Amino acid sequence: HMTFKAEYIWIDGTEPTAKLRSKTKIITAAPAGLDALPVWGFDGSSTNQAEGSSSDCVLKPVFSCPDPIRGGEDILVLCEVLDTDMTPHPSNTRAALAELSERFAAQEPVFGIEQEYTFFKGTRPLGFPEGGFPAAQGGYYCGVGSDEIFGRDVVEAHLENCLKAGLGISGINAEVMPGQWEFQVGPLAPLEVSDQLWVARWLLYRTAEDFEVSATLDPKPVKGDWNGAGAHTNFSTKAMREGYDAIITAAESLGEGSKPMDHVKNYGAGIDDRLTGLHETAPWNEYSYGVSDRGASVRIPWQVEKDGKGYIEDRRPNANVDPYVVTRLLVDTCCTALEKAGQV
Amino acid sequence: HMTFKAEYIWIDGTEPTAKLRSKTKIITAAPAGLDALPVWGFDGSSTNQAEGSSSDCVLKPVFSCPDPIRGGEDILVLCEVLDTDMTPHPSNTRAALAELSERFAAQEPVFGIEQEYTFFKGTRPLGFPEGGFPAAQGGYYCGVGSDEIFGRDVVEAHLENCLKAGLGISGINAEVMPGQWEFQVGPLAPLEVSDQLWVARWLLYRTAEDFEVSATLDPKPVKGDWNGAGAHTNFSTKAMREGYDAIITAAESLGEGSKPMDHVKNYGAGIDDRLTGLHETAPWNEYSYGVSDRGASVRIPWQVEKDGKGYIEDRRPNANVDPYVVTRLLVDTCCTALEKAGQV
Amino acid sequence: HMTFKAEYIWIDGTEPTAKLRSKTKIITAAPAGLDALPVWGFDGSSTNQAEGSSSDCVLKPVFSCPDPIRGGEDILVLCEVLDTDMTPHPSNTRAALAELSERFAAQEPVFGIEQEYTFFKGTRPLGFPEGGFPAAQGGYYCGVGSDEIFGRDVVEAHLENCLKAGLGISGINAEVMPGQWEFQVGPLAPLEVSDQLWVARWLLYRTAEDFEVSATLDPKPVKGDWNGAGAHTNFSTKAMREGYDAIITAAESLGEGSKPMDHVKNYGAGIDDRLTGLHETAPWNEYSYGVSDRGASVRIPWQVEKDGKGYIEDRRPNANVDPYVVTRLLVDTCCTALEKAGQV
Amino acid sequence: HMTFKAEYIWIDGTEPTAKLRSKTKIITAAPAGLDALPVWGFDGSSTNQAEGSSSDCVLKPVFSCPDPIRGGEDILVLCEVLDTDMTPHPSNTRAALAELSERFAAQEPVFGIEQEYTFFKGTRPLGFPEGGFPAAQGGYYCGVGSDEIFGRDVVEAHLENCLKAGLGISGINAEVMPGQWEFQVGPLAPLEVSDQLWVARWLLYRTAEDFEVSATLDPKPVKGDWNGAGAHTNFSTKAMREGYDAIITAAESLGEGSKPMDHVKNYGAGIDDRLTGLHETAPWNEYSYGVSDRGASVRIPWQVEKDGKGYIEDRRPNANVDPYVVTRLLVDTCCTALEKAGQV
Amino acid sequence: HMTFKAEYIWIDGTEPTAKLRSKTKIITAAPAGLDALPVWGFDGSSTNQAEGSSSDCVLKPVFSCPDPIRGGEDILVLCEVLDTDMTPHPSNTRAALAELSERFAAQEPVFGIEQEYTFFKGTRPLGFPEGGFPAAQGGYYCGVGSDEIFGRDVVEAHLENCLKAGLGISGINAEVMPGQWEFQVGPLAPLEVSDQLWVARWLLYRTAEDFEVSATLDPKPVKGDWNGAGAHTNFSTKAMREGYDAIITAAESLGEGSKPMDHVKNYGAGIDDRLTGLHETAPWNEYSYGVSDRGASVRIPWQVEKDGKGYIEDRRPNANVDPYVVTRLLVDTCCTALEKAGQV
Ligand code: NA
Ligand code: NA
Numbered sequence A, B, C, D, E: 001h002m003t004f005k006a007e008y009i010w011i012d013g014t015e016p017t018a019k020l021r022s023k024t025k026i027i028t029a030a031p032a033g034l035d036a037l038p039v040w041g042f043d044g045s046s047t048n049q050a051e052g053s054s055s056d057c058v059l060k061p062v063f064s065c066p067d068p069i070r071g072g073e074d075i076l077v078l079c080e081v082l083d084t085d086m087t088p089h090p091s092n093t094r095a096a097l098a099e100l101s102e103r104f105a106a107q108e109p110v111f112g113i114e115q116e117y118t119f120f121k122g123t124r125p126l127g128f129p130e131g132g133f134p135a136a137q138g139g140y141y142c143g144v145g146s147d148e149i150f151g152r153d154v155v156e157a158h159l160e161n162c163l164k165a166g167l168g169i170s171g172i173n174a175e176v177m178p179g180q181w182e183f184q185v186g187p188l189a190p191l192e193v194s195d196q197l198w199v200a201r202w203l204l205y206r207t208a209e210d211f212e213v214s215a216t217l218d219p220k221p222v223k224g225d226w227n228g229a230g231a232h233t234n235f236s237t238k239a240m241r242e243g244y245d246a247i248i249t250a251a252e253s254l255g256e257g258s259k260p261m262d263h264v265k266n267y268g269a270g271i272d273d274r275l276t277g278l279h280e281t282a283p284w285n286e287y288s289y290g291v292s293d294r295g296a297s298v299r300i301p302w303q304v305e306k307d308g309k310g311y312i313e314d315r316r317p318n319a320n321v322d323p324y325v326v327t328r329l330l331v332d333t334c335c336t337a338l339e340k341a342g343q344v
Helices: A094-103 A152-164 A190-210 A238-242 A244-253 A259-264 A302-307 A323-341 B094-103 B152-164 B190-210 B238-242 B244-253 B259-264 B302-307 B323-341 C094-103 C152-164 C190-210 C238-242 C244-253 C259-264 C302-307 C323-341 D094-103 D152-165 D190-210 D238-242 D244-253 D259-264 D302-307 D323-341 E094-103 E152-164 E190-210 E238-242 E244-253 E259-264 E302-307 E323-341
Strands: A002-011 A020-029 A040-043 A056-066 A075-082 A110-121 A169-174 A180-188 A214-216 A231-236 A289-291 A298-300 A312-314 B004-011 B020-027 B040-043 B056-066 B075-082 B110-121 B169-174 B180-188 B214-216 B231-236 B289-291 B298-300 B312-314 C004-011 C020-027 C040-043 C056-066 C075-082 C110-121 C169-174 C180-188 C214-216 C231-236 C289-291 C298-300 C312-314 D003-011 D020-028 D040-043 D056-066 D075-082 D110-121 D169-174 D180-188 D214-216 D231-236 D289-291 D298-300 D312-314 E003-011 E020-028 E040-043 E056-066 E075-082 E110-121 E169-174 E180-188 E214-216 E231-236 E289-291 E298-300 E312-314
Touching (some): A002 A056, A002 A190, A020 A040, A020 A190, A056 A190, A075 A190, A094 A190, A094 A323, A110 A190, A152 A169, A152 A180, A152 A190, A190 A214, A190 A323, A231 A323, A238 A244, A244 A298, A244 A312, A259 A323, B075 B190, B094 B323, B110 B323, B152 B190, B190 B214, B231 B238, B238 B244, B244 B312, C004 C056, C004 C190, C020 C040, C056 C190, C075 C190, C094 C190, C094 C323, C152 C169, C152 C180, C152 C190, C190 C214, C190 C323, C231 C238, C231 C323, C238 C244, C244 C298, C244 C323, D003 D056, D003 D190, D020 D040, D020 D190, D056 D152, D056 D190, D075 D190, D094 D323, D110 D190, D110 D323, D152 D169, D152 D190, D180 D190, D180 D231, D190 D214, D190 D323, D231 D238, D231 D323, D244 D298, D244 D302, D244 D312, D259 D323, D289 D302, E003 E056, E020 E040, E020 E190, E056 E190, E094 E190, E094 E323, E110 E190, E152 E169, E152 E180, E152 E190, E190 E214, E190 E323, E231 E238, E231 E323, E244 E298, E244 E323, E259 E323
Parallel strands (some): A002 A075, B004 B075, B289 B298, C289 C298, D289 D298, E003 E075, E289 E298
Antiparallel strands (some): A020 C169, A040 A056, A056 A075, A110 A180, A110 A214, A110 A231, A169 A180, A169 B020, A231 A312, A298 A312, B004 B020, B169 B180, B169 D020, B298 B312, C004 C020, C020 E169, C040 C056, C110 C180, C169 C180, C298 C312, D003 D020, D040 D056, D056 D075, D110 D180, D169 D180, D169 E020, D231 D312, E003 E020, E110 E180, E169 E180, E231 E312
16 A cells, blocks of 8 residues: 555634635555544634633644545545544634534535636736736736736646646636736535635635745735625525526525624625725625626626526635635525425 | 537727627537527626626627647537627627628638737847847848847747637747737638637637737837738639739729728728828828839739739728628628629 | 665754754665664764764664655655764764663554644744734634744645655644644654654755754743743653553653652753743642643643543654654653552 | 648849848648648848838748657748749849859769857847957967857757758857857758758757857958858868869869859858958958968868868858859859869 | 778877867768777877977778767777878877787786866856855765755766766766766776777766766866876786785885886876875875875775775876876886786
8 A cells, every 4th residue: 555645734723714724644554434533633823712821732634635646645634623622623613613514414515606706926916017906997807918918837736736636727818907817616525615716816826836936815905996806606506507596585585684794794804995995895784685696795696687597606705715715604594485485 | 428628719899999708608518509508697887898787798709619728528619799688789880791701602601810929028028128229120030049139939839829729820930029029810601700710719819828928909009110010801702713804993992082092091090100291101091002013002012913813901990890891891882892792 | 776865863952942953765675674774983073073073883673664754665764863883872862762662562552643743934034024923822722823823834745755755644733822833742652752752853954955044842932922842742651541540640750759850850941941830831840730730841632630630741852852852751751650569 | 630830031233242031831732742832932121121112021931840849749930032924133142153063063073161240239249248348369269268269058049940840960069269169061062051051040049049149150250360250161072082183173273264253242241351361261351271271261171181182161251141143143253263273 | 882980089199188089070981899980180289299390190990889979870989190191190009009008818807987176167166156165075975965965967867878878887976076077987998998988988977968068187277175087097917806815016116116106207287286195095196005005106906905806006007197197008018027926
């Protein structure tokens, strides 16, 4: 049997937005999926999962895939973080989703996440001239040419790495702001879409190291009329894919009670800076939904309304949202209302 | 079974000159030609097919070829743009040509397009020294050597890419201005010549990104005696290839009525800057045709006149002309006169 | 017959800290393991193993592995240094360890060494800006991304080289200080852990040459709150892996008599700069041990205390400790105390 | 069936020294040698082969070989230039040589050309320091090492390309001036040597583009005691290869009548700058010949005088001579004189 | 039939120190070793083998090997230089050695040469900072790491090149001065060691060209306490390999009569700058020999004295010595004395 490299990847307890951590384990064993991979540990003081004298943390594999960069038999191992007593660590946001995922498995929730990000070279946006601004927006989005496209080599390398890892990438595109890009993950189950997006994020930062650039998931990287970075989330249940009434209930459910504030205060840090009335999308403090409405909080695509079935698009989440969090909330809110409505 | 990349390419509604757009779709299916390729959509506001609050657009594949850059099983997909009701979008200029292509199919129109372009590095022409001018024109055209040739690495990469894509390239050459180049598409039927030229343009910008340079189809990139960039168009019907009388009819039809202004006002933005009396070609406001006359609006090549059959060359179109448009006008004007004349 | 390259590597007599030396021998003989390798010699005057007019030294191979850098049939040969009468040279610290390894072979001592190091470009730390300081520590440790990760290309290259060399590397990680890294060697027998670590160090310096950077094993490369570089050593015997009783015995033995100073004055040059009271760990001048205490001289991990068996961690050795010396001392102190207690 | 690239190369009508021009034709046909290769055309106004209103020029293939740079099935096509009536264009210097070649085919004339050139980076000689002079000549000629050798990478690539092209190269060497080089073509018949040399020149400029340097055939690139660039020509007939009497006849024919100025005024532009009394060879205004005399206009090598048979070397032609011209003149003068003398 | 490149390499008549010259010959023949290779010629005026009006020189192949740089079937041809009458040219030092080799062939003389050299980037030593000095000597010799090792990539390409050439390289190491290196050739017969060392020298300069650095065999490249470059020579005869009495006769013969001055004045230019009293070795004006004496002119290694048989080491020759000269002088002096002594 063989010796291989295992990259253990986890999420820390940094505030307001948590960060990825990883280290390499050299494993000398007979290959098997996930279940044969050892739990591991690290020092919490260094990752804000203590920054104190009593937290030592345990790494528990939850997802694994091939390491496309290292190649060969090497693998990536996404972990959840546990306390020494094997209970979920307070930073752990996966465990809550797993519970809700299981609770609502009958409805078969499916997600697509459109993850945006912006390239930087140091403090400078990669698409910006030093000490200045590029031409106004219009030619960057879905663009071509050196004048309007920045970081394509990175984006292509990242896309190839994600596919080699087996992640469900449906597309990529260049965004409205120069040096701003998007990739779409899904359609997938709530734990699976969330796990893959974190791994895909890890691949983006990591791939970009070789090109000596940085990527940021900051929602408003440059102040002004320059475009924000979102993480639009597409969501449906079997009933929603079957009929239009479920589609309306889900959209209505998000507008009920404290749910608008409940989601928005968990949809990523600095959300007030990105969600303004004037550009995309709607203000963070009011909820709306509509057909083909890019100004609404939630959009129902024109095809969905025509077909009387489909999915809905939540345009509120920031590019820096935790996928474990956004998926949990939408499943908790929408699926609960659908059960009550009998639209299951 | 396989996963492959599809780059969906389209033309936007930008004024005065429309621009290429592209995004990547990841497709998991059994390969089949074009008809099996899914229709797609995009948000028009970002592409001047709204820049408003109401436009959603549909992508309909019309042409496909291998992606020479990605390689393997990856492909390029040229699309036309439709409204949600599947009617042509106002930006769509292919549909009018497709209609005219059908109307005159018995005459069998064929086109060759000589597409010129100029390399730039930022705001600087690639062949120009920073802050200055190179030696006057004369040694650049069909030249050799580092002193007189700029961007050959890009040009060669681009040509190989076109051929791998299966495009009908007949030749390439270095042009009169330093860092100015030409490639020839044809001979082809009107839709095919127009589609392939658009894909070849897209390949040019995209190929040049890797070399950190820009290409421009601006008709007069440098003011003065420096050469303009045209897209000279060669055109014929079966009757023109058979006999000389149809050639004179074709040449005369372009000078009748409002046809000179009708063509010239669709022959690209900034045509007044390129079409001056003094150098190439003829002034934009007067129509002339002649045998072997490079100062004329339309030239009859000396071989065509010797053989009593051949084609004609329209020297008026700018390098920034829409191929869908220039082909449509020539088919409309020339083929209509030939039908009346009985020369079909 | 065939020719292959052999890199003869040794440790000099430099003070306070000894240095690696190497040269290449071209061998035309039939390959066989270690025993067929010729003894060799060198000039001591140049290596601080004379600095006089009478010392000629003999190189005798003790370990060999593939040269991962040269590749093919080429090999690395680690040697010990002997006088011309074939007795150990005064610089030789392996020979003391070899006697003790045999004397206590029944206890089956095993070591793991966590070897930290810092990248430099000239006098500047690789993770530091010129003339300045980076953001405070926190995001570097086990990090990802260009803002926080420096020297990863070297680290992957070094790790792949160690594994190709067949060395027992258990893991690597990015450390608390920017441009600081760690690799873990073990678990291994005392001479074997010591031999492989020296070869791994040589591989680090040599691999880093290709990237035009430097590595240092200096214990406090930057003054202040910036992290020191250590070589934490994990140690156990069969009795220790069997029971908790040996662990207390092992931990107390290190605190008895002159053993704290006996060890500490051999635990690397400049130890007073790294082992300060205020942060990790304990002052270089006081010995303490405790369960899960990162501030102690010796820590008993929580898993070890829970299982009533395991190993102990000596947090005192500097990154510049000689592994032959630190391993010898721990085996000498702990195994002697364990024998007396009957706990073997 | 297959598609391949054909690079049509020709010589223009520029004065005083004509220049190479080239463009690419994409061919989709079954390969066959030269005769199946299409005639082509170009615009003369841009190449000093019109600068007028009546010249359209015809490209007629006369020689072809593989394209060593493009590789595969791609080829280089050397053409001669014709008027539209298929007669030789005034710039065409090949046709005069072809008449004369056939006229004297019984004597079997053969030529070898030692073609010198100098590398430049912009206005700076590649072997020169910026703003200054290198050490005086002596260590450059046939030298080795970075201090004395400049452009070898270009030189090796050019040689490998020529051999891949099938050209008759006998040798290369580094010349007396730094960054000055030589290659030898031959021994060959007059049309072939001239054709191959032109292709070898074209390959030199073209290869050098990739290294971002220039090559010049200027006879005196740097003024002063720095060495000039010549094109020494080796010439013989069957009678000359047979006997010494023909050699004397050949050597004497060049000194008769107006033949010295007749040749010299066609031996390249700026010949007065290179051919001075003081160094090589003899002054441009006097004819001399001698055995082994490098200061003479024409040299009889010592082996030729020893063997009583051989060839002669004309040391007068500049590096910028047209090979079609020098070969025509030497054949015309010597072969005519040999005929009159009866030594054929 | 096939074509291969032959690089003809020779030594010039430059004073005080001769230089390598080379040119390329293109050969079209059936391959065979040495005997099938054509003699060639060159112009002496350019190479200090005339600097007059009467020398044309002949190249006669004496040694050949594969060209490791060109690879494939291409070869290096080391030549000796002859006058046109086929007698040895005055610059030729090989011919003298060939005579003594035959005269003393019965004694079976054998040589090893340790060839030192220093890297330069322009006028600056490669290991020196611009405008200053690096740390004092001690860590460079047999060193590792970017701080102390300079030019290793060149050294490695060169070593691999020499082995591919089939040259007898026994080892390489880094020397006391930064950017100073050594390779050892031998043990071999006098003509073979001398021929291989010249080819190895030629390969070093040539390999170093690709890295854009220079190598020098200057004996004292930086004035002061910085180390000189020598060419230590190991020498033995069959009798010396058999017994110690022969060893003593050889060491004494070198101290007799005019032998110390005869050798020293032929041991390379600038020997007085390297051979000073203070340091290594002995002053150029005094002869001494001793066992293990690094300060003696000639050293008898300790193994030789222990075993009562072996070789001797002449530490006097400069790195810029002609191997043909040092080997001849050593054979003449020692072997002559051994014949008289009856120790043959
Ligand atoms: Na990050
Ligand atoms: Na030299």
